[PDB]
Each structure stands twice: as C-alpha cells, then as structure tokens.
C-alpha cells in the first residue's frame, strides 16, 4: 500500500511535502536580513 504513481516528486500526482517548523523559521531568518538590506540601500 501507499504507492505514488510514477516518480515521486514530478508529474500530476506527486508525493505531498509538508512545511516543518524550522523550515518556516529558516525562511523568516532570511527575510529579516534582506529587510535590513533595504534600509541601508535607502540612504
């Protein structure tokens, strides 16, 4: 049981990927950096 038709991560019916908690934090950490980059590029 539990077959994903074809290849896992391509096509119409893919294996679902879920967002963990550290993946969210990792992205937010990047955003806070680039938001401060906008501030120093403004003067």
């Amino acid at each position: 049981r539990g077959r994903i038709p074809g290849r896992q991560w391509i096509g119409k019916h893919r294996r679902p990927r879920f967002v963990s908690l550290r993946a969210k934090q990792n992205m937010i950490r990047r955003l806070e950096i680039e938001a401060e980059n906008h501030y120093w590029l403004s003067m």
Binding site: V19, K24, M27, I28
Partner: peptide
C-alpha cells in the same frame, strides 16, 4: 506538464508552499 489552470488543485513548488505558510493571517 500541466497547464496553469487545472480542474484539480495543482501542487505548488516547495518554496511557494513555504511562502504561503509564512504569510498566514
């Protein structure tokens, strides 16, 4: 591949899925 408009909800790129999760009310 698949068109941009589909009868079924189309699976997102993982980077987009993460974006939608950070930008939640």
């Amino acid at each position: 591949g698949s068109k941009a408009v589909t009868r079924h909800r189309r699976v997102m790129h993982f980077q987009r899925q993460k974006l939608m999760a950070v930008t939640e009310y």
